């Protein structure tokens, strides 16, 4: 299958008391393996999945001297933006950055990314040609011109086409047996009466990885996912995920309904009837 290595920076100006917090975070597919935090005691890049740990002490040194450098730039950036907009220093504002790369089953580089947001709105982003940028507004247009003259896309592109792809391979190697193994979901249907003429028929899938799943219902055949309750897929805490999907149904009618789970790690679709 295909896999992705992505990094997630967050830069948080806390106005009143203290310089901004800088939280980067590292993922290979749905699995966090790295984290940095700017207001720690002598802050350091740290492992957060086991398989990355057998990596050179060269590595963690170079990664903190990087994470720190980014915290600097993003504190100046947070200020730079605030003045672009003429916003009061009274305010707390955030910059987020996401970059990464999707790779295909052979190693085909599917997509590269580098997107910035200010206060949750798109700010600037690297286009699919990995050579131009989209600036959302007029403030962003000054960042764009700055980055076109500095050749920033060209160094982003090389990172995404090289280091990112190469290192996603190294990561999936270190963590075979973890990363390249899909956990089938534990499926059960429960039933919770509510009235004397209406019950809830929850349909659970537990402990699966990766978080990609789909649950769907069926009333005698007819897809009845229409106003069935689907909850956001949550982490279990052990690195696997859960999601359930209930339908409300009148008494005696349970025997006609039906739930189906498909997930990577399943050989053919699971089918659940009361």
């Amino acid at each position: 299958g295909s896999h992705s290595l992505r990094y997630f920076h967050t830069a948080m100006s806390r106005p009143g008391l203290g310089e901004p917090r800088f939280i980067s975070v590292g993922y290979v597919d749905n699995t966090q393996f790295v984290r940095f935090d700017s207001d720690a005691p002598n802050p350091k890049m740290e492992p957060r999945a086991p398989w990355v740990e057998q990596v050179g002490p060269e590595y963690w040194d170079e990664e903190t001297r990087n994470a720190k450098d980014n915290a600097q730039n993003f504190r100046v950036n947070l200020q730079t933006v605030l003045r672009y907009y003429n916003q009061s220093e009274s305010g707390s504002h955030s910059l987020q950055r996401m970059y990464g790369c999707d790779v295909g089953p052979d190693g085909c580089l599917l997509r590269g990314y580098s997107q910035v947001s200010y206060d949750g709105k798109d700010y600037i982003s690297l286009n699919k040609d990995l050579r131009s940028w989209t600036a959302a507004d007029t403030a962003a247009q000054i960042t764009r011109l700055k980055w076109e003259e500095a050749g920033v896309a060209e160094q982003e592109r090389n990172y995404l086409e090289g280091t990112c792809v190469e290192w996603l391979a190294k990561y999936l190697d270190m963590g075979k047996e973890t990363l390249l193994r899909a956990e089938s979901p534990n499926t059960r249907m429960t039933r919770h009466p509510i009235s004397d003429r209406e019950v809830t028929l929850r349909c659970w899938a537990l402990g699966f990885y990766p978080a990609e799943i789909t649950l769907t219902w069926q009333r005698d055949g007819q897809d009845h996912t229409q106003d069935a309750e689907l909850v956001e897929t949550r982490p279990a805490g052990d690195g696997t995920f859960q999601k359930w999907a209930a339908v409300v149904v009148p008494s005696g009618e349970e025997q006609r309904y039906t739930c189906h789970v498909q997930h990577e790690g399943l050989p053919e679709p699971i089918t659940l009837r009361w």
Binding site: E63, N66, A67, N73, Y159
Partner: peptide, 9 residues
């Protein structure tokens, strides 16, 4: 690995 970036807005 992380990306070495001089991203200044």
């Amino acid at each position: 690995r992380s990306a070495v970036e001089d991203l200044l807005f």
